[PDB]
Write a protein that binds this ligand. Structure first.
Ligand SMILES: CC1=C(/C=C/C(C)=C/C=C/C(C)=C\C(=O)O)C(C)(C)CCC1
Ligand SMILES: CC1=C(/C=C/C(C)=C/C=C/C(C)=C\C(=O)O)C(C)(C)CCC1
Lengths: 161, 161
Protein backbone atom coordinates (compact mmCIF):
# COMPACT_ATOMS: atom_id res chain seq x y z
CA UNK A 1 0.00 0.00 0.00
CA UNK A 2 2.91 2.26 0.99
CA UNK A 3 4.89 3.09 -2.16
CA UNK A 4 7.57 5.09 -0.41
CA UNK A 5 10.69 3.58 1.10
CA UNK A 6 13.91 5.55 1.46
CA UNK A 7 16.90 4.25 -0.48
CA UNK A 8 20.24 3.43 1.11
CA UNK A 9 19.11 3.62 4.72
CA UNK A 10 21.54 3.21 7.62
CA UNK A 11 19.40 1.71 10.38
CA UNK A 12 22.18 1.89 12.92
CA UNK A 13 22.02 5.67 12.39
CA UNK A 14 18.36 6.00 13.50
CA UNK A 15 19.30 4.92 17.00
CA UNK A 16 18.34 7.10 19.92
CA UNK A 17 15.57 9.32 21.19
CA UNK A 18 12.51 10.13 19.10
CA UNK A 19 9.34 12.17 19.57
CA UNK A 20 6.08 11.06 17.92
CA UNK A 21 5.15 14.57 16.71
CA UNK A 22 2.19 13.31 14.72
CA UNK A 23 0.35 10.20 13.58
CA UNK A 24 -2.14 9.05 10.96
CA UNK A 25 -4.32 5.96 10.39
CA UNK A 26 -6.50 4.63 7.55
CA UNK A 27 -9.32 3.93 10.01
CA UNK A 28 -10.41 6.45 12.67
CA UNK A 29 -10.68 3.66 15.23
CA UNK A 30 -6.97 2.87 15.06
CA UNK A 31 -6.24 6.10 16.87
CA UNK A 32 -9.61 7.30 18.17
CA UNK A 33 -9.40 6.45 21.85
CA UNK A 34 -6.54 6.68 24.33
CA UNK A 35 -6.57 2.89 24.25
CA UNK A 36 -6.98 2.74 20.49
CA UNK A 37 -4.96 -0.05 18.89
CA UNK A 38 -2.17 1.80 17.04
CA UNK A 39 -1.93 4.80 19.36
CA UNK A 40 1.70 4.23 20.42
CA UNK A 41 4.35 6.74 21.48
CA UNK A 42 7.98 6.13 20.54
CA UNK A 43 10.45 6.40 23.43
CA UNK A 44 13.52 5.38 21.43
CA UNK A 45 14.78 3.23 18.62
CA UNK A 46 17.65 0.79 19.02
CA UNK A 47 19.02 -1.14 16.03
CA UNK A 48 20.86 -4.37 16.97
CA UNK A 49 24.26 -5.35 15.49
CA UNK A 50 22.54 -8.12 13.55
CA UNK A 51 20.52 -5.36 11.90
CA UNK A 52 17.18 -5.79 13.69
CA UNK A 53 14.99 -2.99 15.03
CA UNK A 54 14.07 -2.77 18.71
CA UNK A 55 11.43 -0.11 19.31
CA UNK A 56 10.66 1.47 22.65
CA UNK A 57 7.23 2.97 23.03
CA UNK A 58 4.66 4.07 25.57
CA UNK A 59 1.05 2.87 25.31
CA UNK A 60 -2.09 3.73 27.28
CA UNK A 61 -3.54 0.49 28.58
CA UNK A 62 -6.17 -0.61 31.11
CA UNK A 63 -6.28 2.84 32.68
CA UNK A 64 -2.63 3.94 32.75
CA UNK A 65 0.31 4.67 30.51
CA UNK A 66 2.33 1.50 29.99
CA UNK A 67 5.85 1.16 28.63
CA UNK A 68 6.35 -1.48 25.91
CA UNK A 69 9.30 -2.98 23.98
CA UNK A 70 9.04 -4.28 20.42
CA UNK A 71 11.36 -6.15 18.06
CA UNK A 72 11.10 -5.71 14.31
CA UNK A 73 13.15 -8.30 12.43
CA UNK A 74 15.10 -7.12 9.41
CA UNK A 75 14.25 -8.47 5.97
CA UNK A 76 16.05 -8.45 2.64
CA UNK A 77 14.93 -4.88 2.12
CA UNK A 78 16.91 -2.49 4.32
CA UNK A 79 13.99 -0.15 5.10
CA UNK A 80 11.48 -2.93 5.76
CA UNK A 81 11.19 -4.92 8.99
CA UNK A 82 8.63 -7.35 10.39
CA UNK A 83 7.56 -7.27 14.03
CA UNK A 84 7.12 -10.77 15.49
CA UNK A 85 3.40 -11.42 15.93
CA UNK A 86 -0.09 -12.43 14.82
CA UNK A 87 -1.80 -11.47 11.54
CA UNK A 88 1.56 -10.34 10.06
CA UNK A 89 2.68 -6.72 10.41
CA UNK A 90 5.39 -4.82 8.50
CA UNK A 91 7.27 -1.67 9.46
CA UNK A 92 8.44 0.68 6.68
CA UNK A 93 10.89 3.56 6.95
CA UNK A 94 9.85 6.15 4.35
CA UNK A 95 12.39 8.94 4.84
CA UNK A 96 14.90 10.24 7.36
CA UNK A 97 17.93 12.42 7.97
CA UNK A 98 18.79 10.52 11.16
CA UNK A 99 19.28 13.69 13.19
CA UNK A 100 16.07 15.66 12.70
CA UNK A 101 13.16 13.50 11.64
CA UNK A 102 11.94 10.04 10.62
CA UNK A 103 8.77 9.09 8.72
CA UNK A 104 7.80 5.42 9.08
CA UNK A 105 4.59 3.45 8.58
CA UNK A 106 3.16 0.19 9.85
CA UNK A 107 0.81 -1.97 7.80
CA UNK A 108 -0.72 -5.40 8.23
CA UNK A 109 0.04 -7.29 5.01
CA UNK A 110 -2.60 -8.81 2.69
CA UNK A 111 -4.81 -5.90 1.57
CA UNK A 112 -3.94 -3.65 4.51
CA UNK A 113 -6.56 -0.90 3.95
CA UNK A 114 -7.88 -2.19 7.25
CA UNK A 115 -4.33 -1.72 8.52
CA UNK A 116 -2.04 1.30 8.19
CA UNK A 117 -0.70 3.96 10.53
CA UNK A 118 2.22 6.35 9.97
CA UNK A 119 4.10 8.61 12.36
CA UNK A 120 6.40 11.60 12.16
CA UNK A 121 9.30 11.06 14.55
CA UNK A 122 11.37 14.06 15.52
CA UNK A 123 14.50 14.23 17.68
CA UNK A 124 13.50 17.24 19.79
CA UNK A 125 10.19 18.12 21.47
CA UNK A 126 9.68 21.10 19.15
CA UNK A 127 7.14 21.32 16.34
CA UNK A 128 9.05 20.89 13.09
CA UNK A 129 7.06 22.25 10.19
CA UNK A 130 9.56 21.02 7.61
CA UNK A 131 9.08 17.49 8.96
CA UNK A 132 5.29 17.86 9.18
CA UNK A 133 5.23 18.79 5.52
CA UNK A 134 7.17 15.75 4.31
CA UNK A 135 4.79 13.70 6.42
CA UNK A 136 1.74 15.33 4.95
CA UNK A 137 3.16 14.95 1.44
CA UNK A 138 4.05 11.28 1.95
CA UNK A 139 0.54 10.51 3.18
CA UNK A 140 -1.05 12.48 0.35
CA UNK A 141 -1.59 9.34 -1.73
CA UNK A 142 -2.37 7.27 1.38
CA UNK A 143 -5.97 6.55 2.40
CA UNK A 144 -5.83 8.14 5.89
CA UNK A 145 -8.91 9.20 7.86
CA UNK A 146 -7.48 10.23 11.22
CA UNK A 147 -4.49 12.49 11.92
CA UNK A 148 -3.09 13.54 15.29
CA UNK A 149 -0.54 16.26 16.12
CA UNK A 150 1.07 16.84 19.51
CA UNK A 151 2.49 19.95 21.13
CA UNK A 152 5.84 20.34 22.93
CA UNK A 153 4.10 20.22 26.33
CA UNK A 154 2.36 16.98 25.46
CA UNK A 155 5.62 15.57 24.03
CA UNK A 156 7.42 15.98 27.36
CA UNK A 157 4.59 14.06 29.01
CA UNK A 158 4.04 10.33 29.35
CA UNK A 159 1.55 9.12 26.76
CA UNK A 160 1.33 12.74 25.60
CA UNK A 161 -1.20 13.75 28.25
CA UNK B 1 -12.63 -21.80 9.27
CA UNK B 2 -14.14 -23.06 12.53
CA UNK B 3 -17.43 -24.82 11.72
CA UNK B 4 -18.36 -25.57 15.29
CA UNK B 5 -20.26 -23.18 17.52
CA UNK B 6 -22.42 -24.38 20.39
CA UNK B 7 -26.13 -23.60 20.14
CA UNK B 8 -28.07 -21.77 22.84
CA UNK B 9 -25.09 -20.62 24.88
CA UNK B 10 -25.50 -18.75 28.17
CA UNK B 11 -22.40 -16.56 28.34
CA UNK B 12 -23.22 -15.32 31.82
CA UNK B 13 -22.88 -18.97 32.88
CA UNK B 14 -19.23 -19.31 31.76
CA UNK B 15 -18.18 -16.79 34.37
CA UNK B 16 -15.46 -17.70 36.82
CA UNK B 17 -12.19 -19.56 37.07
CA UNK B 18 -10.76 -21.55 34.18
CA UNK B 19 -7.63 -23.62 33.56
CA UNK B 20 -6.05 -23.72 30.09
CA UNK B 21 -5.50 -27.50 30.12
CA UNK B 22 -4.38 -27.57 26.51
CA UNK B 23 -3.93 -25.46 23.39
CA UNK B 24 -3.52 -25.82 19.64
CA UNK B 25 -2.47 -23.55 16.75
CA UNK B 26 -2.46 -23.78 12.94
CA UNK B 27 1.13 -22.53 12.84
CA UNK B 28 3.85 -23.87 15.16
CA UNK B 29 5.14 -20.35 15.72
CA UNK B 30 1.91 -19.21 17.37
CA UNK B 31 2.76 -21.30 20.39
CA UNK B 32 6.40 -22.30 19.92
CA UNK B 33 8.19 -20.00 22.35
CA UNK B 34 7.27 -18.83 25.84
CA UNK B 35 6.75 -15.44 24.22
CA UNK B 36 4.95 -16.88 21.22
CA UNK B 37 2.03 -14.75 20.07
CA UNK B 38 -1.04 -16.79 21.06
CA UNK B 39 0.47 -18.53 24.09
CA UNK B 40 -1.97 -17.10 26.65
CA UNK B 41 -3.21 -18.60 29.93
CA UNK B 42 -6.78 -17.95 31.04
CA UNK B 43 -7.14 -16.69 34.62
CA UNK B 44 -10.90 -16.17 34.50
CA UNK B 45 -13.80 -15.20 32.31
CA UNK B 46 -16.24 -12.45 33.21
CA UNK B 47 -19.30 -11.74 31.05
CA UNK B 48 -20.70 -8.19 31.44
CA UNK B 49 -24.43 -7.46 31.90
CA UNK B 50 -24.48 -5.96 28.41
CA UNK B 51 -23.39 -9.40 27.20
CA UNK B 52 -19.73 -8.73 26.44
CA UNK B 53 -16.81 -11.01 27.31
CA UNK B 54 -13.96 -9.83 29.54
CA UNK B 55 -11.12 -12.34 29.56
CA UNK B 56 -8.40 -12.52 32.17
CA UNK B 57 -5.18 -14.18 31.14
CA UNK B 58 -1.51 -14.48 31.96
CA UNK B 59 1.12 -13.98 29.26
CA UNK B 60 4.90 -14.38 29.26
CA UNK B 61 6.39 -11.11 28.07
CA UNK B 62 9.81 -9.43 27.96
CA UNK B 63 11.24 -11.94 30.44
CA UNK B 64 8.46 -12.41 32.99
CA UNK B 65 4.89 -13.59 33.33
CA UNK B 66 2.53 -10.67 32.79
CA UNK B 67 -1.15 -10.45 33.66
CA UNK B 68 -3.44 -9.10 30.91
CA UNK B 69 -7.13 -8.14 30.57
CA UNK B 70 -9.10 -8.44 27.32
CA UNK B 71 -12.56 -7.40 26.17
CA UNK B 72 -14.40 -9.35 23.50
CA UNK B 73 -17.47 -7.50 22.25
CA UNK B 74 -20.61 -9.54 21.65
CA UNK B 75 -22.02 -9.83 18.14
CA UNK B 76 -25.37 -10.96 16.76
CA UNK B 77 -24.27 -14.54 17.21
CA UNK B 78 -24.33 -15.55 20.88
CA UNK B 79 -21.20 -17.74 20.75
CA UNK B 80 -19.15 -15.29 18.68
CA UNK B 81 -17.36 -12.21 20.04
CA UNK B 82 -14.80 -9.80 18.62
CA UNK B 83 -11.88 -8.53 20.67
CA UNK B 84 -11.16 -4.83 20.06
CA UNK B 85 -7.96 -4.56 18.03
CA UNK B 86 -5.87 -4.56 14.85
CA UNK B 87 -6.19 -6.99 11.91
CA UNK B 88 -9.62 -8.15 13.20
CA UNK B 89 -9.86 -11.14 15.55
CA UNK B 90 -12.88 -13.27 16.46
CA UNK B 91 -13.47 -15.49 19.50
CA UNK B 92 -15.68 -18.58 19.10
CA UNK B 93 -17.13 -20.76 21.84
CA UNK B 94 -17.41 -24.29 20.44
CA UNK B 95 -18.83 -26.27 23.35
CA UNK B 96 -19.29 -26.09 27.11
CA UNK B 97 -21.14 -27.42 30.13
CA UNK B 98 -20.29 -24.29 32.14
CA UNK B 99 -19.14 -26.27 35.17
CA UNK B 100 -16.53 -28.68 33.81
CA UNK B 101 -15.04 -27.53 30.53
CA UNK B 102 -15.07 -24.99 27.71
CA UNK B 103 -13.68 -25.32 24.17
CA UNK B 104 -13.16 -21.98 22.40
CA UNK B 105 -11.09 -20.83 19.44
CA UNK B 106 -9.64 -17.56 18.22
CA UNK B 107 -9.16 -16.75 14.55
CA UNK B 108 -8.13 -13.67 12.60
CA UNK B 109 -10.81 -13.17 9.94
CA UNK B 110 -10.16 -13.08 6.17
CA UNK B 111 -8.60 -16.47 5.31
CA UNK B 112 -7.36 -17.19 8.82
CA UNK B 113 -5.17 -20.25 8.06
CA UNK B 114 -2.41 -17.92 9.18
CA UNK B 115 -4.53 -17.36 12.27
CA UNK B 116 -6.18 -19.92 14.55
CA UNK B 117 -5.61 -21.20 18.07
CA UNK B 118 -7.99 -23.20 20.28
CA UNK B 119 -7.88 -24.02 23.98
CA UNK B 120 -9.47 -26.51 26.34
CA UNK B 121 -10.58 -24.66 29.47
CA UNK B 122 -11.32 -26.71 32.55
CA UNK B 123 -12.64 -25.56 35.93
CA UNK B 124 -10.24 -27.56 38.12
CA UNK B 125 -6.47 -28.12 37.82
CA UNK B 126 -6.97 -31.82 37.07
CA UNK B 127 -6.45 -33.50 33.71
CA UNK B 128 -9.88 -34.18 32.27
CA UNK B 129 -9.71 -36.85 29.61
CA UNK B 130 -13.36 -36.45 28.66
CA UNK B 131 -12.68 -32.77 27.93
CA UNK B 132 -9.42 -33.52 26.11
CA UNK B 133 -11.30 -35.86 23.81
CA UNK B 134 -13.97 -33.34 22.80
CA UNK B 135 -11.11 -30.94 22.15
CA UNK B 136 -9.23 -33.42 20.04
CA UNK B 137 -12.42 -34.32 18.15
CA UNK B 138 -13.34 -30.67 17.53
CA UNK B 139 -9.89 -29.94 16.13
CA UNK B 140 -9.92 -33.08 14.00
CA UNK B 141 -11.06 -31.15 10.92
CA UNK B 142 -8.95 -28.13 11.88
CA UNK B 143 -5.54 -27.54 10.30
CA UNK B 144 -3.48 -27.54 13.54
CA UNK B 145 0.28 -28.11 13.66
CA UNK B 146 1.14 -27.49 17.30
CA UNK B 147 -0.60 -28.85 20.40
CA UNK B 148 0.29 -28.24 24.05
CA UNK B 149 -0.97 -30.03 27.18
CA UNK B 150 -0.30 -28.97 30.77
CA UNK B 151 -0.13 -30.93 33.99
CA UNK B 152 -1.81 -30.11 37.33
CA UNK B 153 1.51 -28.85 38.76
CA UNK B 154 2.01 -26.50 35.84
CA UNK B 155 -1.64 -25.38 36.06
CA UNK B 156 -1.18 -24.15 39.64
CA UNK B 157 1.80 -22.13 38.46
CA UNK B 158 1.94 -18.69 36.88
CA UNK B 159 2.36 -18.98 33.12
CA UNK B 160 2.37 -22.75 33.63
CA UNK B 161 6.06 -22.93 34.53
C1 LIG C 1 1.47 1.54 14.45
C2 LIG C 1 2.89 2.01 14.40
C3 LIG C 1 3.90 1.29 14.93
C4 LIG C 1 3.73 -0.01 15.60
C5 LIG C 1 3.38 -0.33 16.84
C6 LIG C 1 3.34 -1.72 17.33
C7 LIG C 1 3.22 -2.86 16.36
C8 LIG C 1 3.42 -1.92 18.65
C9 LIG C 1 3.41 -3.18 19.39
C10 LIG C 1 2.56 -3.38 20.40
C11 LIG C 1 2.43 -4.62 21.20
C12 LIG C 1 3.38 -5.76 20.93
C13 LIG C 1 1.29 -4.94 21.82
C14 LIG C 1 0.14 -4.13 22.25
O1 LIG C 1 -0.04 -2.95 21.83
O2 LIG C 1 -0.67 -4.66 23.06
C15 LIG C 1 5.34 1.69 14.71
C16 LIG C 1 5.90 2.22 16.03
C17 LIG C 1 6.15 0.43 14.32
C18 LIG C 1 5.54 2.74 13.60
C19 LIG C 1 4.51 3.87 13.77
C20 LIG C 1 3.11 3.24 13.56
C1 LIG D 1 -5.50 -17.13 21.13
C2 LIG D 1 -6.63 -17.38 22.09
C3 LIG D 1 -7.24 -16.39 22.74
C4 LIG D 1 -6.90 -14.96 22.60
C5 LIG D 1 -5.96 -14.22 23.17
C6 LIG D 1 -5.84 -12.76 22.94
C7 LIG D 1 -6.44 -12.14 21.71
C8 LIG D 1 -5.19 -12.04 23.85
C9 LIG D 1 -4.93 -10.60 23.86
C10 LIG D 1 -3.70 -10.12 24.03
C11 LIG D 1 -3.31 -8.70 24.03
C12 LIG D 1 -4.38 -7.65 23.90
C13 LIG D 1 -2.07 -8.31 23.71
C14 LIG D 1 -0.78 -9.02 23.70
O1 LIG D 1 -0.71 -10.27 23.78
O2 LIG D 1 0.27 -8.32 23.62
C15 LIG D 1 -8.49 -16.64 23.55
C16 LIG D 1 -8.14 -16.52 25.04
C17 LIG D 1 -9.54 -15.55 23.22
C18 LIG D 1 -9.14 -18.02 23.30
C19 LIG D 1 -8.05 -19.11 23.29
C20 LIG D 1 -7.11 -18.81 22.11
Amino acid sequence: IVTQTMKGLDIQKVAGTWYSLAMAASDISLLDAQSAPLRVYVEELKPTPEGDLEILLQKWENGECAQKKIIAEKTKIPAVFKIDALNENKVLVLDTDYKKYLLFCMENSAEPEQSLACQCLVRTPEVDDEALEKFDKALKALPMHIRLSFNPTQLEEQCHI
